[PDB]
Structure 1
Amino acid sequence: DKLNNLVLFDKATYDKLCKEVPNYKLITPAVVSERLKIRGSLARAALQELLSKGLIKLVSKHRAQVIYTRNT
């Protein structure tokens, strides 16, 4: 029915993100938003933050689609 995606990081959500996102083999805003039940703009912000800390590898950048994946 009506989705109730979180607008901001909860504590358990942030911890689960930080220790379960960096092993997915495919990192896009859509997959994190759908399987973490979060708003996609904050999904993009979280992915940008994980890229900023040097832990996730960007593959290609676009205005339409951005894709990341694991370092190793």
Structure 2
Amino acid sequence: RDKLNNLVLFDKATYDKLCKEVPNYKLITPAVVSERLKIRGSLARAALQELLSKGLIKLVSKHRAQVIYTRNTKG
């Protein structure tokens, strides 16, 4: 039938999407970012940890099972 092959590391244009897009989403989770960029949950987490430490997305809660961020406020 059908199979899923996500990226272990970013393609140039996929990272260009990530650097442009995922700070526009209201809900930022590694599972959401994994589906929305065709990337393994390991890549999703590592990328969103970059985005946070960089200082771009506002984290709401961390937990071993569930890590949730949002787009930072406007004003």
Q: Same fold (TM over 0.5)?
A: yes
**How many pairs are equivalent?**
72
Indicate the SS of the match to 1:22.
Answer: helix
| Cα distance in 2 for residues equivalent to 1:14 and 1:64 | 25
Q: What residue is the counterpart of 2:27 in the other structure?
A: 26
Which TM-score applies when normalising by structure 2?
0.93
Unaligned runs of 5+ in 2: none
How far residue 41 of structure 1 moved from its aligned partner, in angstroms, is: 0.7
Tell me the C-alpha RMSD between the 2 structures: 0.6
Where does structure 1 lack aligned partners over 5 or more consecutive residues?
none
| TM-score of the superposed pair, with normalisation by structure 1 | 0.97
Shift of 1:2: 1.0
Identity %: 100
Give, in whole Å, the separation in 2 of the partners of 1:35 and 1:50. 16
1:16-59 residue CA offsets vs partner (Å, 9 max, x unmatched) = 11000100100000001011111111100000000010000100
* Distance in 2 (alpha carbons) for counterparts of 1:51 and 1:43: 12
**Whose radius of gyration is greater, 1 or 2?**
2
Write the distance in 2 (CA, Å) between the matches of 1:42 and 1:35.
Answer: 12
Q: Distance in 2 between matches of 1:9 and 1:52?
A: 19
Inter-partner Cα distance in structure 1 for 2:64 and 2:31: 14
